[PDB]
Design a protein around this nucleic acid. Structure first.
Lengths: 117, 56, 151, 91, 76
RNA sequence: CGCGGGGUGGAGCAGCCUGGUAGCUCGUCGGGCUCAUAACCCGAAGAUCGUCGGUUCAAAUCCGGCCCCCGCAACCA
RNA sequence: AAGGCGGCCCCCUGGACGAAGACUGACGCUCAGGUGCGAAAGCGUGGGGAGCAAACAGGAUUAGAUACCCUGGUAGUCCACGCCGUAAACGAUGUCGACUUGGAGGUUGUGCCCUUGAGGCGUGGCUUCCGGAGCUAACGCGUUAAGUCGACCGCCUGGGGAGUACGGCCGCAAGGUUAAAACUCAAAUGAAUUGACGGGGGCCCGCACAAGCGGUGGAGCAUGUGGUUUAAUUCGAUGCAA
């Protein structure tokens, strides 16, 4: 319906899940898919493979604009940091730049207590 | 750790670079460190212990 | 094999063709130390396969073996309470052994009248890459490619 | 509908421990469940003359407000005796 | 309570009712999905067993939030 | 003729003013875990939603009767 | 000084150390009582309130689960001014001074050397790890002493009872401080040793697993056992090791 050809893959990779969002340079959301909503729950949801099909499913709800180049923004420590990026590149995508944007406070907010499991 | 792929460099090599930039930068270590509160007494305890192990 | 590594016994070659490979084959087909009767069945199967399928007896053997030969496989492993499946790249010597072994086993699990006819038709099927033995290689790969993440 | 949940009252469960979990057992009943008391005697097919029917009977008698019991069973099956407790039935 | 919506719907044709109660008639699932999309709303299967199945155009999230709100408030 | 709250599966509930296949607990019968049992885990059985008339696309939930249980109320000497 | 103190900048301010020489002339050390300081939590008034989180609510786990885990979340955690005066407030080691072999570092002054190199030779302060004699029950300490001596202070006198009671002082309170006895036991305790054990850990072996080939578990029969039966089915062997 419209045209971009130049995008950015923001991947949010937490421990429990990994959300993939495709966007233009402006930061406007073009398409998105998550692992948790691609048929993966709990123990399987938090896997690199689930992040992979997330990246794959996302490349199908965006090529309506015919993106052809993009940059990658890796946020968080979970799986699908890396495997998500791979799936994008195999789905027919030229990777321009890779950047980690995981936030690091300069020691500000006190985090939750340690879990005594 | 910002990375920019150079021409006729495979997606893989650039990636391996990126992962080593983060290995170099200490991102995941850093995120692990802050997931949970550590008491001051505890991090002082950690600090002595590693000083000690860092004698061979 | 905790401590003691070893070499491997280097069996004599096939008496008829002078092939160590076929010696690995007759032995694998052999049962109850009936060597005399084992090589009889292997040859008649090769003779049946050779005569009426374009000859080149050693080569015919390879065409079939080429097809059941597996490049990778999985090795079970138990880490943190979990039985992970690690896909391992398998070495050439054994590659032949599995290939030969699955061809032999698929032959006895067959309907035909004798082991020689069965063996022959297994080789033929394998030569055209079809049948049970080839399918055994494919399951190995489907099972391997699945756990590709943990290599 | 009415579910079966359960509580237990072992021997050595008196007032202290007991009516605390008579509070727990209200809770079960008061969800609108049929709250099944299980005795679990240090005992036998006739463990007690004490263990069970102090407890059970006083659980009924204290909870009697909100809950009543289906039966005062006093037929032990095994080394343990179910007193079955329900919502107090509207006539 | 829970209704299946949008692409989860398998019916070939549905009877469509819009967000204001207008009876749009029998529509192919495809056309029903188009109408919902142009209005930035969801296609909700409100009567799965009706003949043909009945769909209502509405904001599913807003509907569900209000339903849960109602249930919670009346019980606290 | 006299108040309260309820009637759904074997027992007790949720689904209620927010009317479209009635789900959630204890029991029931199986399966799993154990050397075995208790405990625990995977599961299936199990219904005119009291009974009717109204009312409606379809009313569990919608109204009112018949009727029943409990609630205190009462047999208040 | 201890408690404790960490982004950057300024202002006010305490202490420590070095170099050189001048001045005072034993003005010093220690300190019961006294005074001051003193983490966190807690208290009072008024602010402030993102995150965290006692209490509390809800979801789970469980035989139970007033917990551990999850979703929330009040005091509190923050500021001002007051209170409290306690901690495994620890180096579990009081302060001051003199003396007694060494090695490797960290930190911070200062004198000297073609500064000719990020150095070469000295000389103070603090500090970390080893270690010598000596000390010590051992562990260990070992010029920063737990060595060799001296000055002064605080404290101990078997375990429980008890840092409790009573009295006094202190505090809004919570409570703090000083501090007994009856009664009861023949122990309580420290360090180290040999085992055993750890949801304990490390390293290593065995057809232990893994890699293979053939079996047992099904069937019929042989055989042993249990059980059941019998007048009797004789006695024994019973997890691996019947």
């Amino acid at each position: 319906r419209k045209q971009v050809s130049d995008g950015v893959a923001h991947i949010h990779a937490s421990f429990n899940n990994t959300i993939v969002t495709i966007t233009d340079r402006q930061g406007n959301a073009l398409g998105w898919a998550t692992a948790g909503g691609s048929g993966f729950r709990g123990s399987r949801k938090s896997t690199p493979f689930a992040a992979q099909v997330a990246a794959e499913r996302c490349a199908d709800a965006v090529k309506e604009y015919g993106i052809k180049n993009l940059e990658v923004m890796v946020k968080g420590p979970g799986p699908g940091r890396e495997s998500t990026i791979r799936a994008l590149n195999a789905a027919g995508f030229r990777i321009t730049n890779i950047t980690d944007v995981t936030p690091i406070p300069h020691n500000g907010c006190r985090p939750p207590k340690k879990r005594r499991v | 750790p910002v990375i920019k792929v150079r021409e006729n460099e495979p997606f893989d090599v650039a990636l391996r670079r990126f992962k080593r930039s983060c290995e170099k930068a200490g991102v995941l270590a850093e995120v692990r460190r802050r997931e949970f509160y550590e008491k001051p007494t505890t991090e002082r305890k950690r600090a002595k212990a590693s000083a000690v192990k860092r004698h061979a | 094999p905790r401590r003691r590594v070893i070499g491997q016994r280097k069996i004599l070659p096939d008496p008829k063709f002078g092939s160590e490979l076929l010696a690995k084959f007759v032995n694998i087909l052999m049962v109850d130390g009936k060597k005399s009767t084992a090589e009889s069945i292997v040859y008649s199967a090769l003779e049946t396969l050779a005569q009426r399928s374009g000859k080149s007896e050693l080569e015919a053997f390879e065409v079939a073996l080429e097809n059941v030969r597996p490049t990778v496989e999985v090795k079970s492993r138990r880490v943190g309470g979990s039985t992970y499946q690690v896909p391992v790249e398998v070495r050439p010597v054994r590659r032949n052994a599995l290939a030969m072994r699955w061809i032999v086993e698929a032959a006895r699990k067959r309907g035909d009248k004798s082991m020689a006819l069965r063996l022959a038709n297994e080789l033929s099927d394998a030569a055209e890459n079809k049948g049970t033995a080839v399918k055994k290689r494919e399951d190995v790969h489907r099972m391997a490619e699945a756990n590709k993440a943990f290599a | 509908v009415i579910q079966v949940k359960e509580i237990k009252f072992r021997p050595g469960t008196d007032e202290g421990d007991y009516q605390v979990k008579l509070r727990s057992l209200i809770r079960f009943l008061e969800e609108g469940d049929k709250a099944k008391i299980t005795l679990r005697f240090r005992g036998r097919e006739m463990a007690h003359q004490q263990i069970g029917m102090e407890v059970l009977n006083r659980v009924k008698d204290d909870l009697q407000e909100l809950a009543v019991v289906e039966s005062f069973p006093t037929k032990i099956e095994g080394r343990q005796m179910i007193m079955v407790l329900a919502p107090k039935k509207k006539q | 309570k829970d209704f299946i919506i949008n692409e989860q719907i398998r019916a070939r044709e549905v009877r469509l009712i819009d967000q204001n109660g207008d009876q749009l008639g029998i529509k192919s699932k495809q056309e029903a999905l188009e109408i919902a999309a142009r209005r930035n709303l969801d296609l909700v299967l409100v009567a799965p067993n009706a003949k043909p199945p009945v769909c209502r155009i509405m904001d599913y999230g807003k509907f569900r939030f209000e339903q849960q709100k109602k249930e919670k408030e009346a019980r606290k």
